[PDB]
TrEMBL record, chains A, B, C:
Pfam families: Tautomerase_2. It comes from coryneform bacterium. PANTHER family: TAUTOMERASE YOLI-RELATED (PTHR38460). This is FG41 Malonate Semialdehyde Decarboxylase. InterPro entries: Tauto_MSAD, Tautomerase/MIF_sf.
Length: 131, 131, 131
């Protein structure tokens, strides 16, 4: 999967990387992807640039929001996706990211929609095994 | 929906926030989403980092391009999406964004592809109503 | 299509642009999209904020990775995508982007998911031909 993590520049570089590490540990545990199937883009913002409310659920967030956008191939069940959300949030709690400040979205594609390098689609050639 | 708004640094911090306000308000009007269903990431770029032309439609854009990438649940009709494009662009005009400088894209997913926080999939649990 | 190109800040302004040009030229050569159907957002990061390993394929990348995320409408064949992945990488090679350092992902939507400006959905109105 390719993960876009948009968070706030108020967080230290150390913590930003820990957040990234946390997200990856979680996906590996839940999804059983290769340990090295790690592809993440960390974009830090002034908190004013991230606006994330509650869709009327009834809770507030701090300014230190963390938005995690997961681009992964289709196939995963609803419960597996629920597991991902729970796993990521839990792994982020101890490293200073509150549950209220996590927002997660999934966007799917297919195996043939990926090139890991060298201009090759490794799922299509079979060099890389599909989950 | 999660809205990625990429625009340029020549626009005032004030104007951006206003741009963001107008896009949200447009979506509440056309999509009838909860008023607090606001999830936006603002990335201001050096204009050289955004290259948006006209696909041969025969018009020019200022360097101050504004690209709106809407990530929303599948199900909206073709006509509703047209209403969204038009409402957004009409709301941006008075704010200082010419019609030529707007570009909008929609990318879809499922209700079970969202966690609004706390590690839960609110659309799945029933904590949050589905469109 | 809309392309998110995420690369590292150490690359020069001229190189960033040639990288963007190389990617566009590739899509034109392979997808036969219009020459001016060009929509690219570039984001430069400290290399620490782009994390791309090998998914266990058994190779290493330099810090100067380039992630290219193609948002385009569905319809292209697997083989055509293979050819796209190839073209992009081959075009980027002499620009100083090694094959090891390119990561490509594709995300699809529909013709009615596009506004090229002026509050209009151009594929829907016939103003622009479905490619």
């Amino acid at each position: 999967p390719l993960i876009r993590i948009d968070l706030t520049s108020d967080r230290s570089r150390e913590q930003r990387r820990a957040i990234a590490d946390a997200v990856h540990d979680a996906l590996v545990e839940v999804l059983a992807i290769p340990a090295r199937d790690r592809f993440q883009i960390l974009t830090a913002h002034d908190p004013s640039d991230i606006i994330a409310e509650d869709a009327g659920l009834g809770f507030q967030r701090s300014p230190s929001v963390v938005i995690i956008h997961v681009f992964t191939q289709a196939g995963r069940t609803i419960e597996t996706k629920q597991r991902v959300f729970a796993a990521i949030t839990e792994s982020l709690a101890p490293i200073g990211v509150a549950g209220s400040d996590v927002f997660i979205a999934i966007t799917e594609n297919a195996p043939h929609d990926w090139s890991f390098g060298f201009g090759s689609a490794q799922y299509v050639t079979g060099e890389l095994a599909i989950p």
